């Protein structure tokens, strides 16, 4: 179980760690988060009390280094940094733990929620969507645009998700126009899975990462990406059975975790009605359809 210490908390802020969150008051004696489960990526995220504009946060994996948070009064945010001196770090953490100045990652033992939301998410793939190679962790915020959004403007601050566009030459084989548009299996299986992602695990990892950035930062382009990746599967007549069964599990836990009060902005009516009731896979997502019908029957 690993630790992300904080130097201090000089401004009042709501701090999230994965699906948990807690309020820290201005200059409250808070010095970080302990007992963080090893084996998963994690995200630590921030919303300032005095300017709820800009949720921002950091994706990290404690196996890759010793990370801490330190407020920067010039740039006005909590920054993640790597401490390269291992003994300094261990000594800092031990002092903060002894004085009980840390909150504990509050995982219930029965609870697989975070695993289920990050099953296919790997730090190395995050670092290719979010390009900042000098750091082992990745910054994301509410306002960052995607490569596809910029095509339709600062490239260094972009989310480089895989571009999916149903009316593009990549998606449509010459001479198979009607076939490929109405049944997207060749775009899903040949272009995307075999060609670009290499396997369904990487596809699901990017789908899960897009959802998490949408939910935790209200990142609109991430929400577009999540829905596009769902629709590309649902609109394919030919999908491996193991992918359909896994997708149902993935979406079930995403829908289960979504704040009830954010459904209006985080869920696209057209995509979900099409996926659950019109598409080739309308009868392949039993768990997802049941939770959607019982939790968000208005959207449908």
């Amino acid at each position: 179980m690993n630790t992300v210490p904080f130097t201090s908390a000089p401004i009042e802020v709501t701090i999230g760690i994965d699906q948990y969150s807690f309020n820290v008051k201005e200059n409250q004696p808070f010095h970080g988060i302990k007992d963080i489960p090893i084996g998963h990526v994690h995200v630590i995220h921030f919303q300032h009390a005095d300017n709820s504009s800009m949720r921002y946060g950091y994706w990290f994996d404690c196996r890759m280094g010793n990370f801490y948070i330190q407020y920067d009064p010039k740039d006005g945010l909590y920054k993640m940094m790597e401490e390269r001196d291992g003994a300094k770090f261990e000594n800092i953490v031990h002092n903060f733990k002894e004085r009980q100045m840390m909150v504990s990652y509050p995982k219930i033992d029965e609870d697989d929620t975070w695993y289920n939301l990050t099953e296919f998410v790997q730090m190395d793939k995050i670092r290719k969507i979010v390009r900042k190679d000098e750091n082992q962790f990745s910054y994301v915020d509410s306002s960052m645009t995607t490569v596809q959004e910029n095509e339709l403007s600062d490239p260094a601050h972009s989310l480089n998700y895989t571009v999916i566009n149903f009316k593009s030459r990549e998606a449509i084989r010459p001479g198979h126009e009607m076939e490929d548009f109405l049944d997207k299996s060749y775009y899903l299986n040949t272009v995307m899975l075999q060609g670009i992602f290499k396997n369904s695990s990487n596809y699901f990892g990017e789908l899960q990462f897009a959802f998490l950035n949408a939910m935790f930062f209200g990142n609109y382009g991430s929400s577009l990406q999540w829905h596009a990746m769902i629709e590309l599967i649902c609109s394919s007549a030919t999908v491996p059975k193991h992918m359909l069964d896994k997708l149902d599990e993935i979406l079930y836990y995403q829908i289960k975790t979504l704040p009830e009060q954010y459904s209006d902005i985080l869920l696209n009516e057209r995509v979900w009605n099409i996926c659950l009731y019109s598409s080739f896979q309308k009868n392949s997502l039993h768990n997802t359809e049941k939770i959607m019908e019982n939790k968000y029957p208005e959207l449908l």
Partner: protein, 237 residues
């Protein structure tokens, strides 16, 4: 975006454009079977692709063989239309290709956009105008060439005959749409108006009768009356 009453003069500027109407591509007669069920029999159809500035009509005849062994024909018909319009554009010299294609029905947008991916600079546009191009098969010479076709065929016409020698393309389009609206509202009466007088004939190389300017004013007035009349007979006013 969409073409409407506000931007109507754009049809007659010098940017090449085509209307595409697909309402006569897939045509059927509905009938009873020996067992008392219902079945359809396809008949030949046509894509109506018109340059409104010049009157050039690219009439692609859709022979019933294209439907053989196919399912969901009303959906296929939109994609076949888009395939044939794309093929027409590719056949034209670059300087003759349209800058815009206006589809008369919104269900043609995605099929045509997908078939024209290779032409990103050709705008595919809907229209809010309710244009009467379905009545094209009420023009006797167009109906005749469609029904006689034994194979897929493209036939080129000028739907304005020689009118552009005397009137502008705005006036010619207005006359065409009035004629077609009348034929659509009451075909028998419209055709009576157009042909009642045996001394005014249709030239071999034309579609409509050889009316003088004054006779066209009379004809146009009679067509408006018909449309108002039928509007009367319909709503009881």
């Amino acid at each position: 975006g969409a073409m409407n009453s506000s931007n109507y003069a754009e049809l007659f500027n010098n940017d090449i454009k085509l209307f595409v109407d697909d309402t006569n591509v897939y045509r059927v007669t509905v009938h009873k079977t020996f067992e008392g069920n219902v079945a359809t029999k396809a008949i030949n159809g046509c894509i109506f692709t018109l340059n409104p500035k010049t009157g050039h009509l690219f009439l692609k005849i859709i022979h019933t063989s294209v439907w053989a062994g196919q399912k969901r024909l009303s959906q296929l018909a939109k994609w076949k239309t888009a395939e044939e319009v794309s093929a027409l554009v590719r056949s034209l010299p670059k300087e003759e290709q349209p800058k815009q294609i206006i589809v008369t029905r919104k269900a043609m947008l995605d099929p045509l956009e997908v078939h024209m991916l290779d032409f990103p600079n050709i705008a595919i546009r809907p229209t809010e105008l309710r244009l009467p191009f379905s009545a094209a098969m009420s023009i006797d010479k167009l109906s005749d060439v469609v029904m006689k076709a034994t194979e897929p065929q493209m036939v080129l016409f000028n739907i304005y005959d020689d009118w552009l020698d005397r009137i502008s393309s705005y006036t010619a389009f207005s006359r065409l749409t009035l004629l077609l609206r009348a034929l659509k509202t009451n075909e028998e009466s419209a055709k009576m108006i157009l042909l009642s007088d045996p001394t005014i004939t249709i030239k071999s190389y034309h579609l409509w009768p050889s009316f003088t300017d004054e006779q066209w004013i009379t004809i146009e007035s009679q067509m408006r009356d018909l449309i108002l009349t039928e509007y009367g007979r319909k709503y009881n006013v």
